[PDB]
Structure 1
Amino acid sequence: SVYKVLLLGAPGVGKSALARIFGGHTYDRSIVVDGEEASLMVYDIWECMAMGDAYVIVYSVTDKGSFEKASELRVQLRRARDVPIILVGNKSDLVRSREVSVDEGRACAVVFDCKFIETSAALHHNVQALFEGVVRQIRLRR
């Protein structure tokens, strides 16, 4: 039961940051979601066919570019290849230089069939939740 999770997105959004947090390259760690264990391997790929159990697409809420690159990715993913996709708006802490609102993320995931969450790698906020929902989401689509 080793779920393989791919970390995708535009440059500088905070991918390597999210991987590192979650697993103290490729990142290993087992977690408990709903009474049930779970062994995630997280691939910070921008640091192989495509053998992914889930995709996390990260954008920064301070970078509209990264955000619209994310939709573009989401559509690509869907045309090419099923596997669950999680849409992540990282950097929720930079309240000031924010370019994408929460609602824009949610009301764009829902329509393009992603799980949405905002994280802040800098404040270890929702990084836990993110990788928990990744596990849950792989289970929702057996």
Structure 2
Amino acid sequence: SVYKVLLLGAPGVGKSALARIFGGVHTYDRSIVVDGEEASLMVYDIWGDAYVIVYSVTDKGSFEKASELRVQLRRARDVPIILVGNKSDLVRSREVSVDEGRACAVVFDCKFIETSAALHHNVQALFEGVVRQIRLRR
């Protein structure tokens, strides 16, 4: 019983940072307990049992690319998709709002979370969600 997770997204959004925090220990293994049940995770920083599409909240381009990739996945080859807006710490140079990120997620059938790899914020919550989500579909 594997849980392979593919890390997708535009350049420099924080993909490896998120993976390296979670792991582990680019392929990153790690066994977490959600939310009563042990679950193992294999996180793939490619640049699947779930796709994590990362954008930077300070980079509106990576956000639109994120949406573009979401519709691509929806048309190709179902699997959970998590939309992640990383770098929530850079409050001055933010170009995408939370609600804009959360509203995008609903309409296009994503789970949504904002993280900051810099502050280790919601990184654990992200990967616990992925497990929960894989579990909704299975």
Is TM > 0.5 for Structure 1 vs Structure 2?
A: yes
Gap runs ≥5 in structure 1:
47-51
1:18 pairs with 2:18: yes
Superposed CA offset, 1:55-103 (max 9, x none): 0000000000000000000000000121000000000000000000000
Q: How far apart are 1:34 and its partner, in Å? A: 1.2
| Percentage of matched positions with identical amino acids | 100
Superposed CA offset, 1:87-131 (max 9, x none): 000000000000000000000000000000000000000000000
TM-score (norm 1): 0.95
Q: How far apart are 1:17 and its partner, in Å? A: 0.3
Gap runs ≥5 in structure 2:
none
Q: How far apart are 1:35 and its partner, in Å? A: 1.0
Q: How far apart are 1:136 and its partner, in Å? A: 0.2
Query: Following the alignment from structure 1 to structure 2, what is the Cα–Cα distance between the partners of residues 27 and 59?
Result: 20
Query: Following the alignment from structure 2 to structure 1, what is the Cα–Cα distance between the partners of residues 9 and 41?
Result: 19
Q: How does 1:1-142 map to 2 (within 5 A)?
A: 1-24=1-24, 25-46=26-47, 52-142=48-138
Q: How far apart are 1:36 and its partner, in Å? A: 0.2
- Report SS of the residue matched to 2:51: strand
1:49 maps to none
Q: How far apart are 1:2 and its partner, in Å? A: 1.5
- Report SS of the residue matched to 1:32: strand
Query: Following the alignment from structure 1 to structure 2, what is the Cα–Cα distance between the partners of residues 34 and 17?
Result: 24
Q: For this pair of structures, how many residues does the alignment match?
A: 137
Query: Following the alignment from structure 2 to structure 1, what is the Cα–Cα distance between the partners of residues 57 and 77?
Result: 27
For the aligned residues, what is the CA RMSD?
A: 0.5
TM-score (norm 2): 0.98
Query: Following the alignment from structure 1 to structure 2, what is the Cα–Cα distance between the partners of residues 116 and 76?
Result: 18
